Structures are given as C-alpha cells and as structure tokens.
RNA sequence: UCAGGGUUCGAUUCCGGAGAGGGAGCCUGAGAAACGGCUACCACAUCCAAGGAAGGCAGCAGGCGCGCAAAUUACCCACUCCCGACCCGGGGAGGUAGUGACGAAAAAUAACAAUACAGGACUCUUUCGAGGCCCUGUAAUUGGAAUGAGUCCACUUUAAAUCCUUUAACGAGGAUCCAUUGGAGGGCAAGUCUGGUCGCAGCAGCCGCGGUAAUUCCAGCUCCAAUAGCGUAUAUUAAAGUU
RNA sequence: CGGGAAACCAAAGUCUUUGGGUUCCGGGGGGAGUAUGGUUGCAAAGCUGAAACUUAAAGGAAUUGACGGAAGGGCACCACC
RNA sequence: GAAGACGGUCGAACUUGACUAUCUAGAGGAAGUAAAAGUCGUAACAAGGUUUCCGUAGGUGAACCUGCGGAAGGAUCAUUA
RNA sequence: CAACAAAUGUUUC
C-alpha cells in the first residue's frame, strides 16, 4: 500500500520570470496545468540529484559504475539522453525538454498524425493509437527509442478503419430514412 | 565562540544549549505546557460554546468602529471566551443561547487588528456556517 | 432614530460623562466628524450612537445649541420642565 | 465603553442594490483554457513596445 | 521536514512489552496468574412470581455519552493462512462488497479545415500601393472528421456478485452531457473600473484603506492564480545563522 | 593594515577565508527583579525567579533641521536706544 | 474419599488518623495592568530655568524632595599662573 | 570679575 507524490511546487509563488517559462511551455505543450508542468520540474530535479551525488563519488567505484551507467543506460533508453552525455559529467549539464519532448502528444504532431499538440492529446485521450497490439490513452505516456515506429491508429477507430462513427453512422442514416424512404 | 572546544566537552554543550532553549518562547511553550494549561482552546484547534450575549466592542485608535462579537461558555471547560462575528450583518446570524464553533484568528493566540481582547472568531452556527449564511446558500434552520 | 442625551461630567481623551434625559448615565465617545471642530460639555445637548447593545452606553455623533433651547420647549423634545 | 449602538448593523449591504447576475460564456477546459492564456498573453502576445500595457485596464 | 549539518514525530498494517470494568486470588494443563475460565471484594448494570438468579464489545458490526473529529446492525471460508480426530469440519483471523476528496496515481467537460476577416518578421516599389510565409484569434456558420461520463443485449470478475479492465444498440452545435475556490492598494501574481455608500457597513495576519472624483469596501464587469480541486483554523517543521 | 552599524577600536585587530584555552550572560518590548517557594539577614533588605495579560515597535547609531532662560554670533526704529 | 475444620502464609477490601503530590470553591482585601481624549499639583527631554542619573536612607497631595558616597552616558577631553 | 523667573490648553489634515 505503499505510495508517493510525483510533483513538487516552487519554493515561491510569484516570479514573473518563471511563470512565463512555463507558460511557453504548456503551450507548445499541448499541456494542461502547471502541475503538469510541475510535475515535469520535479521528475528533473530528482534525476539532477541523483546525477549530482554520483559525480561526486569516484570512478570506477563498485557503486559509482554499478549504478552511474544504469543511470545513463536508463535515461538514453527513453531518449532523452545520449551517449557523451551518457556519462554524468552530461545529465548535469541537461533539461526539462528533453523529458517533455518523449510524451506521446507531441508525437502524433510530430508525423502529420495530428498537426498539432492539440489534436494529438484528444486523439489519445480518445482511443485512436496504438503504441503496436496496445490502445494507449495517456496523453502522458513517454515513447520509447525501438518503440517510436509502432504508433499508429487503432484497429478500429474509424481511422485505423472499421465502420465509421457514433457520429458519422448517424450522418449515414441521416440521408437514409427520409430521402431515400417514408 | 563563547563555547568550549574540547573533544570531550559534548556534555557542557550540550547542556549549555539545553539551558538556553528556555529562553524561546515557541519551545518554553511546548515543554510546560501551556496549550493544555492555560489556553481556552483545549490545545485544540477548534472549540465549541453558546452564546451568552451580543457584545459591540470599541475598535482600538486610529480606527473606529462598533466591533461585534459575541461572548461563549466553551462546553468542553465550561470556559467563557469572546468570539468575533465577521462579514456584514451576520450577528444577525447568532442569538443568544445559540451553540457556536469558534476558531483561533491565525495569530498565534494574539489578538488581531484593532479589534481589542478578542482572539477567536465564530465559523458554524445552525451547526450552519455564516459563510453559507451570509451568501444564503443554506438557512438559520429552525 | 433615537433621542437625545445632556452632559453631566467630564473624562477626557474621548470619554464624556453624559446624562440622557431618559434618566440614563453612560460614557458617551465623542464623534469623529463632530470633534473636529466640537468639544462636547459639561452642560450642554448631544446626540451620541446606539444600537442593539443594551444601550448601556453611546458615542458622541453631533452637538447642540443653547440659544434654540429656549425653542426646545417648541422642539416638541424636553417637558415644561427642562 | 461599549453601551452604544448597532442600530446600523448591516446597513450596507442591505442598502447595496442588487445586481442581477447578466451572463454570458463559458470558459474554457482546462488545458484547452490554458492554451488560450498562453496564446492571449505569448502568442498574442506579440506586444509592442509601447513601454508596456496592461491585463485589466479601461481606456 | 530535503544544502550539508540538522529539526520534529512515532498510539496506529511488523517486532518487543502491557491489559481486558477496578483490585486481589486460583484451578486446569507442557504452556495461563487467562477474564468469549472461575472466585471474593470494590464500582456498575440486569431479570424476579422478591426467595432467588444470571453479566462484562481497550473482539466484529451497531448504539449512548464525548467531542474538532472518524464507515455496514452487509456477503464468504473460494483466496491467504490457522486449528482439530481433520484432504472433507470450523474460523467477524482473514478475504469480499458498502461508506470513504486522510491522502496518493492516471486526467474528461471538446479536435481539424474552410470562407471570412484582424493582424507581424520576408519581398517588390522613390513613395502610394501590392505580393507573401508563419499563422492566431474572431465570427459566420459550415463542413465533414471524433470519444466515455451516462445508458445497455452479451461477456468478463469472483465463493456468488459489484466495480475496474470488455462491448453490439444509444450517448457533444452549446441555452451545453452547464468547473470550481480564493485574490486584484503594498508584501503579492491582478481594475491609475462602473453604480452604491462616506472613517458608516465593512476590509485589513502586518503596513494600512473608507471623513462625497474609494484602483483596498459592497456588488457587477473585467482580470489574475491554483484547478477536481481550492479556501480557512491548528499542532509542528522548513524559512530561522530568531537557539 | 584590519575591525565595527557607526561613534569609534593597536584592540573592540588576526570573524563567512567563520575553529588558541577556558568561564559567564542574552534571544522583541512592557508585566518584573514583580508573584510564589527556598535561602541569608536583628532589621532595613539581598540571592534565585515565573505566569496571566499586554503590545508592533521598544531600542541603537549616524544625518539633517526646527528650537534653546548653551557658547561666539549677528542684522532691522515692522527691535531697543 | 466430600462438607466442615486446627493454625499459618499471601492479602483484596473496609474504618480512623498521618504524609506527599496535583487540582479546584471563596465574603472581602490589596497590587499590577489596559489606558488611553478626566481631576489636582510641576517632581525629573534645551543647563527643562534646582545639570542629570546610580547606590541607599528618611520624608512628601501627586509628579517628587533631600543628605551621604558614585558616574558622565554633561553643560568641561584645555588653562595656559 | 562673579551671579539671575516663569503655567495650561479644540478636528480630518
């Protein structure tokens, strides 16, 4: 039953300079909130500290190699990282974008199958991709590396095929009992 | 440095600082403690009362004004307080013999602006809330 | 909507000994408009605040006149015996 | 030091006319209302240099 | 609670210890100073045809009292395990549903063109003027393009069900299938507003506002911030190199 | 040199580049050196020493006026002579 | 081999005093506090017209006054014989 | 050359 928090707020509140930043972000980040943002701030900074303490502790050390390049090997899998950075003295050097730009959302932009950050979190959020043999609805997902070709639409969702929609097998009878019949 | 500096004076230091926590007032506070002793409010966040009468208190210079609170025998130790009644009209709310939920100012246990000598607030009558009073979300029930 | 009062003593630093002619001896405060260029006293008509508060006591609002006291009888206000 | 008054208790409010509530829209779902903020206030947003301007302002 | 040092809590899913109304004693048994054993007193309560007689929810539900504060008088031994003579029985252990914004995760309440326009870096031109890419709005409605929230054959779940995770038939033109809660004088993010009041009502942790052109009030309008959450009170911690 | 808020300071220096030894007292201001118990005192009093409540400044230093029945001061019958 | 029973040990409980700790009623009395725009005096920021203040003692409507020894944080960092 | 009195009191600002 255990659990934690995936986010953390800012020290402050007020800081024009920062409110901005994430604003720019959340736009070209089809995002939804600050938390959204936030949450996104916390991830880094965890992954900073946890970057930070292992530069710190000498090469070569059983516990330094031993968790230093699973932390690289981890963080490059994802492709936010890559290799000279995947050494350490790199992810010090790295940022929030770099997570961001992993989401599904910004994908289904990314090739056509959307045109815009937009269409794609709705498109997610309703049923119409597959990451391969699996219906993905979070807009939130982060698209691994071998992963990147398998999205596609759904089997069956009309696009991805099958019938038409709710909607548009409406319109289909909507031409169907009146002017075709009584 | 006004402190030793001895590998072996952990015990002078230690004490030293043991000595002058005291003079803290957040600290003496807890450790005689007071909340429980002293305080109207059990060492409780929030407490309930009735309402013995309706007084109009006269705000502290440079302000002026007729203040309105209402003075409560606390159930829990039979401890008579004097409660501020907030917004506009909502004394209208609260009758005498009423039952009240009275709540801490946000001030540490001092009282707050020119209100003189109250340091508590009503938040429920009708069991009712005033806020839900005032808007008339919800009625004085009866 | 209220009556009147009539000072018998003085405090001072906002603070009046009055007599409301009711029969009724509180402290009354000076108010704020009128202490500007009032300064209530010890024999004379004044007209202070009070609501729903027992009435045990009032603050000063405004001020009187001697002269119109004479008139006070036709103020329809104090009895023929003020 | 107290005696005095609340006669006027509520004397405002109860003399403040009401005012109907009008109406008009709906503000936007979450992240859809965000993307107008960042639109209106970044992309809109191209500003000038006028020296500056303003978000709740009249004339 | 995070510099580092530290600072505070720990009854509470485990371990060790303690108790079953308060006290004391004891039987049995390998093991008990046992209370879903007994026995006395002590405090409490109950039945009675009044002589008698029977009792202990800091077990599970539930109820009173108490309070700032806390759920079903529900289903099952199938899982997990335990016990017994036991494969087979029995288990308010325990599972299972109901209540459940402690609190934590995922994150809906609407996406894409088109006219239509409103616009800016680019180019051309002496200028006027025109073209132009990147597009955002903003209507005008269009236009095709969409999904579960509900609802529901069927099926799954499981002891049997529920819900989830599954889906035929339905379910989005806004007046919605209708998002909130605080703030907009300073700190502090946001009205050198409009009506109303005139140091009144109120606001205001602090500094301070309001005494007739109130950017602090009271309301709207408008805008901000956090957003299925947000305000408020309080213990305590960070900030506090004010221990 | 360097210290300090400055006034100042060869110590009040060698203090964020914070670490020579040791001892003592203070943690906003008032309540208060007060209450209360202990102790010492012939007595007067002394030592130890709270709280409730009260309140947003108490305070320090320098700077400048204003002002003085402070010093050198001047100037004018709106001053005296 | 039971009731019962001799005497003992543990010893609940009960009755009366003592002891210690913690808490709490109270006629009235006297402080301090708020505090504050009141009354009577002028006690002591400009030498506040009696320089101020400390220790201490006596005394006074009240601020306070006064002696005795201190201090300048004073109104003198000087005295020129 | 040295030395020398004096009270109280109304408003937003």
């Known amino acids: 039953w255990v659990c934690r928090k995936t986010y953390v707020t800012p020290r402050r509140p007020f800081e024009k300079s920062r409110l901005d930043q994430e604003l720019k972000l959340i736009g070209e980040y089809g995002l939804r909130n600050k938390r959204e943002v936030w949450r996104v701030k916390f991830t880094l900074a965890k992954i900073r500290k946890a970057a930070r303490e292992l530069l710190t502790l000498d090469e070569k050390d059983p516990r330094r190699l031993f968790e230093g390049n699973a932390l690289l090997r981890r963080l490059v899998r994802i492709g936010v990282l890559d290799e000279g950075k995947m050494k350490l003295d790199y992810i010090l050097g790295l940022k929030i974008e770099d997570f961001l730009e992993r989401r599904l959302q910004t994908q289904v932009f990314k090739l056509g199958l959307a045109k815009s950050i937009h269409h794609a979190r709705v498109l997610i959020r309703q049923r119409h991709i597959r990451v391969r043999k699996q219906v993905v609805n979070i807009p939130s997902f982060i698209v691994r590396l071998d992963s990147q070709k398998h999205i596609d639409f759904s089997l069956r969702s009309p696009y991805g095929g099958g019938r038409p929609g709710r909607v548009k097998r409406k319109n289909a009878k909507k031409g169907q009992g009146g002017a075709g019949a009584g | 440095m006004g402190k030793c500096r001895g590998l072996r004076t952990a015990r002078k230091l230690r004490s030293h600082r043991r000595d002058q926590k005291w003079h803290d007032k957040q600290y003496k506070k807890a450790h005689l403690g007071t909340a429980l002793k002293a305080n109207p409010f059990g060492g409780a966040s929030h407490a309930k009362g009735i309402v013995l009468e309706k007084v109009g208190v006269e705000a502290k210079q440079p302000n002026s004004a007729i203040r309105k609170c209402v003075r409560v025998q606390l159930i829990k130790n039979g401890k008579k307080i004097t409660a501020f009644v907030p917004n506009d009209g909502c004394l209208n709310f609260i009758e005498e013999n009423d039952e009240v939920l009275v709540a801490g100012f946000g001030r540490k246990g001092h009282a707050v602006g020119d209100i003189p000598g109250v340091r508590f607030k009503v938040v429920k009558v009708a069991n009712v809330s005033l806020l839900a009073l005032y808007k008339g979300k919800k009625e004085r029930p009866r | ?82 | 030091k107290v005696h005095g008054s609340l006669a006027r208790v509520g004397k405002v409010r109860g003399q403040t006319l009401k005012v109907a509530k009008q109406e008009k829209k709906k503000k936007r779902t979450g992240r859809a209302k965000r993307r107008m903020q960042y639109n209106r206030r970044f992309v809109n947003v191209v500003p000038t240099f006028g020296k500056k301007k303003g978000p709740n302002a009249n004339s």
């Not at chain 3, 000072?7 to 704020?32: P, Q, S």
């Not at chain 3, 300064?39 to 009032?58: C, E, F, H, M, P």
Request: with cysteine; net charge positive; proline share 1%.
């Open chain 3, 1 to 82: 909507g209220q009556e009147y009062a009539q000072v018998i003593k003085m405090l001072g630093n906002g603070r009046l000994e009055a007599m409301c002619f009711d029969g009724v001896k509180r402290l009354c405060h000076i108010r704020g408009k009128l202490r500007k260029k009032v300064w209530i006293n010890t024999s004379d008509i004044i007209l202070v605040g009070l609501r729903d508060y027992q009435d045990n006591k009032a603050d000063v609002i405004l001020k009187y006149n001697a002269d119109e006291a004479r008139s006070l009888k036709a103020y329809g206000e104090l009895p023929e015996h003020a």
